[PDB]
From a paper:
Procapsids are built by multiple copies of coat and scaffolding protein polymerized into an icosahedral shell that incorporates one dodecameric [name] at a special 5-fold vertex. [name] forms a channel for bidirectional passage of viral DNA, which can move in and out of the virus head and provides an attachment point for the tail apparatus in tailed bacteriophages. Packaging of viral genomes inside procapsids is powered by an ATP-dependent motor that assembles at the portal vertex. In [name], this motor consists of a large (L-) and small (S-) terminase subunit assembled in an oligomeric complex.
Numbering used by the authors:
A (entry chain H): 9 to 593
B (entry chain I): 306 to 458
C (entry chain G): 408 to 593
D (entry chain I): 52 to 204
E (entry chain G): 306 to 356
F (entry chain G): 205 to 255
């Protein structure tokens, strides 16, 4: 027992229902169906109580505070790629759904229910090569985490452990034609799982035929720079290290080994986890970058798995009493045949037709003429009852007034700050931007190269080897028009797919933080006051000349770019991007 | 944050104040959820002969007449008997009023911390002063132990 | 029982001014507009081109010029010669292509999702829900306002941005109207 | 019978958790005039050229709640000195607080405040975590059958 | 944009609270409209010896 | 039609026409043998990266 790995250790999870069904499954149901469980003899005519939903919805809509719009972030360390022309990183991002709105349907239930993400087809789906940039991301669909219990979780979102844990959707049928994109598979994978029916099978859905796809599972790759010795012929030469130097360099003395990232290899045998079933026969898909990001929250409990947060259980048994008053009230009107009109109907009900027309002045039914009894008056003007008007339940629930609602508790304050933004803004912004796994520098398909170095110009490099002189621009010229006067046509350094690491490949700056930054946001957003921070002055107005243009991307107003830039003369302010305007003499 | 005299450090805490203090709430649970088993079982008792009839009585069939009664009774004479009282009632709703009010008052006390109109040297408290920086637990950037350095090339 | 009905009709209970009541239901709108466009413009098989993208008959005007001998250029002076749409020499590269096929022109020009207002000089002039008169002013801020209150563009008399700007004031040059030709003299 | 509805004590501390907004207290490396400010060329990039996008600012708060809930501890680290393609100075340290697992942990050493050298490192214990168990690959990997015996809570 | 449970599902309306949300207002309707026909002539009667 | 309910209208008179239901279109031009067997020489694509 080696290859088998974690599932035998994972059987204690999925064995049976135990307490992680009845207790947990209330997470997402509270908004739907009903409340009561064990209490005996529950009665009819109210089948959907709701009396949960008003709690969560509006406050789920109270998380909308997160546009956080600052873009095209320039790199302050050194030259970012292409500079002026690279502004379009967000090109396809902002247009449809994703972070702008679709986070609505994406996040959905987190505090109330389990949260995560769901499936995707391949990774980068756009067909046609072209000049522009591209951004494509996740598109999860439907609410498949209810019964899901998946354990490898000790830590956090960003952990370096097995990536995205394991991937299974509970049941998929349309997906039968969705994974048909592979090569001619026998189509019957026939898994056998036990989803408890308690042997009477209440619900009849038989769906089966599930698979799982991957190649590299927990691919373990470390620094491990040439650590071993040839002497004594030790086995287990597998490389290890912590810090590169330690012993420093024994090189110039001896021990020449020199092997770089070529390994005829054994890999960890956790395989398509199952006892007797494995395939692992020639399949390759990209590598695991896995931009798909299921999110998993945090709350208190001993350790391992959890009974996760919900706030509604204060009211549930404040609900039950609003349901039980209909057990004490609506039933008794049915328990009362309303009035039985007998005071001395000795003859019971005769002459039934006197109930036809219901007027009949001569009622009768009354004579006395009986055995020896005596005169015993009776005063049932209250009938016979011990009537109790619900005085107790009222105040019993008056202490529970706010506590049977007990929500929308947030955003209470006079005005401005100290308001309704709690950690859930930064935690669900952790559901947004906090993923470190996407980044930039990933090299898999060809998105990687920009100019590419042309993979040619070496053959043309001979011009600088030409003898005699080397001279810069002389002898005027007229028709030249646009720039790039080209004879040498020579550059330096190199151009390749990636920039390596922590040079040029950085992604997104700052963190959760201020909504105001260095680009020309003054403009139209001030709610209360207006101005007075920068009054007039003689240099002041020649300072504000270039400031206030709001263009972003306009059309009719673009003549701004001209400015005075023809002749720099006595201003020469920005010294801008494109030389094309300023280079004439 | 723990104070101690005896070798077992005892907490100093908030929520433990009212724990049993507001068991005064469970006294509504000690009546309607528990001893409600005193259930009314209200019987108008005057002339249903003996109470045991055929099942028709409490099933509420469309046949109206409820008459069970005929009387020639035991021999006493010239005297009534009055069942009127029947079973029980809700419990003396007075003395329970202020208990919950005191608990809730102690609760609105803990909502008073550094209370201001607003601003005016705002709401910094003990827990901020103690919790302000783990950056100063992270103070380390070679602050005492210096190792890593630029070293241009 | 009244306390039950008050719960369901509440969406984003708010005071006034900013911090609005937008819900996910509002976003059905551009789910519907996207339910239009990408069902149309995302496929252009035939008609973008007016007449077969030029009908490609006019290329026959290319007959004699590419011959290595000298080609006639440099009109002598001229005054009214500048008018648009004439064809004699016709120096132009290739021609426009229909449908989508290989190079650029496939899919372009959709909306910018965001708050209520737009900009064609609009959230410049927005104001509304936040007070009034947010525009700062300065001495040469009126050269920003030599555009003045011009708003609606193509209209008949808001057209002042073009004709009134068309000749005498070109020493400024901040304008960029839509006008086809101009040049000539004073 | 029917119990577990009580709860309802929570909101009192829900005000005490939400101060996090001011928890950042932004300040960055104020130099002095007694050192050499001419060496400040790198300083302006401290928050920039090494760690720039940083999630751990929320990890402070994970400790902030459990603080008022119970004691606040500290946990494991992965060395910030990383990766490949060596570069310039680029140093800032990190720690990410986890949730609890301090419950039955018993410490007697000092347990007040530590600015300076003090006791180095003494005791770390967790009951029924997983974490870096199967991740042993890059550390030692000989046998690891040791596994002391305790009375599990 | 709504929630989900399984497969595709019974539609959740805002009317799910309004079904019985009207509750027992209708019970005051029980004492008036047609049920006086159920009551046989509220009888003001005493000392009517007319046989 | 729940056969006990008195309602009159039965007949309908209108229809509709299906077009695409689980109908798969494929292009998948690349990556198979030039000469020797040409078995299943045309089939769908998985990764677009490189050969």
């Amino acid at each position: 027992e080696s290859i088998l790995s974690r599932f035998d250790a994972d059987w204690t999870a999925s064995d049976e229902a135990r307490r992680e069904a009845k207790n947990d499954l209330f997470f997402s149901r509270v908004s739907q169906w009903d409340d009561w469980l064990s209490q005996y003899t529950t009665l009819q005519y109210r089948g959907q109580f709701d009396v949960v939903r008003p709690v969560v919805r509006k406050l789920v809509s109270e998380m909308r505070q997160n546009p956080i719009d600052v873009l095209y972030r320039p790199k302050d360390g050194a030259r970012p790629d292409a500079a002026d022309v690279l502004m379009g990183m967000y090109r396809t991002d902002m247009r449809h759904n994703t972070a702008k709105i679709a986070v609505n349907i994406a996040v959905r239930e987190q505090i109330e229910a389990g949260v995560g993400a769901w499936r995707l087809v391949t990774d980068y789906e756009d067909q046609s090569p072209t000049s522009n940039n591209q951004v494509i991301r996740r598109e999860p669909i439907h609410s498949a985490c209810s019964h899901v219990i998946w354990d490898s979780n000790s830590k956090l979102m960003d952990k370096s452990d097995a990536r995205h844990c394991t991937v299974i959707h509970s049941m998929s049928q349309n997906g039968w034609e969705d994974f048909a994109e592979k090569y001619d598979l026998d189509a019957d994978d026939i898994p056998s799982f036990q989803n408890p029916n308690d042997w009477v099978f209440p619900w009849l859905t038989q769906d089966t035929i599930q698979i799982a796809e991957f190649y590299e599972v927990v691919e373990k790759k470390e620094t491990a720079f040439i650590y071993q010795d040839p002497v004594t012929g030790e086995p287990v030469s597998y490389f290890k290290r912590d810090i590169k130097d330690v012993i420093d360099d024994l090189a110039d003395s001896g021990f020449i080994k020199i092997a770089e990232r070529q390994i005829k290899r054994r890999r960890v045998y956790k395989s398509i986890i199952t006892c007797t079933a494995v395939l692992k026969d020639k399949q390759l898909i990209a590598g695991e970058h896995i931009p798909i990001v299921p999110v998993f929250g945090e709350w208190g409990f001993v350790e391992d798995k959890e009974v996760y947060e919900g706030v509604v259980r204060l009211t549930k048994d404040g609900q039950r009493l609003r349901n039980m008053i209909m057990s004490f009230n609506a039933d008794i009107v049915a328990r009362t045949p309303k009035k039985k009109p007998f005071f001395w109907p000795e003859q019971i009900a005769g002459f039934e037709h006197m109930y036809d027309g219901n007027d009949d002045y001569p009622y009768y039914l009354l004579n006395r003429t009986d055995e020896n009894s005596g005169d015993l008056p009776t005063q049932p003007l209250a009938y016979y009852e011990n009537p109790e008007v619900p005085q107790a339940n009222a105040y019993m629930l008056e202490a529970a007034t706010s506590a049977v609602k007990e929500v929308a508790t947030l955003g209470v304050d006079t005005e401005a700050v100290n308001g309704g933004q709690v950690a859930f803004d930064t935690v669900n912004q952790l559901n947004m931007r906090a993923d470190l796994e996407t980044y930039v520098f990933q090299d898999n398909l060809a998105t990687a190269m920009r100019r590419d170095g042309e993979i040619y110009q070496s053959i043309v490099n001979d011009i600088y080897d030409v003898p005699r002189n080397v001279t810069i621009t002389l002898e005027d010229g007229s028709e030249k028009d646009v720039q790039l006067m080209a004879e040498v046509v020579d550059l330096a350094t190199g151009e390749k797919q990636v920039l390596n690491d922590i040079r040029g490949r950085y992604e997104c700056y700052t963190d959760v933080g201020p909504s105001f930054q260095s680009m020309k946001q003054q403009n139209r957003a001030e709610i209360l006051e207006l101005l007075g921070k920068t009054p007039q002055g003689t240099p002041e107005y020649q300072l504000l000349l270039l400031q206030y243009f709001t263009l972003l991307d306009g059309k009719g107003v673009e003549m701004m770019r001209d400015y005075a830039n023809k002749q720099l003369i006595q201003m020469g302010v920005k010294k801008p991007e494109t030389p094309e305007e300023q280079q004439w003499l």
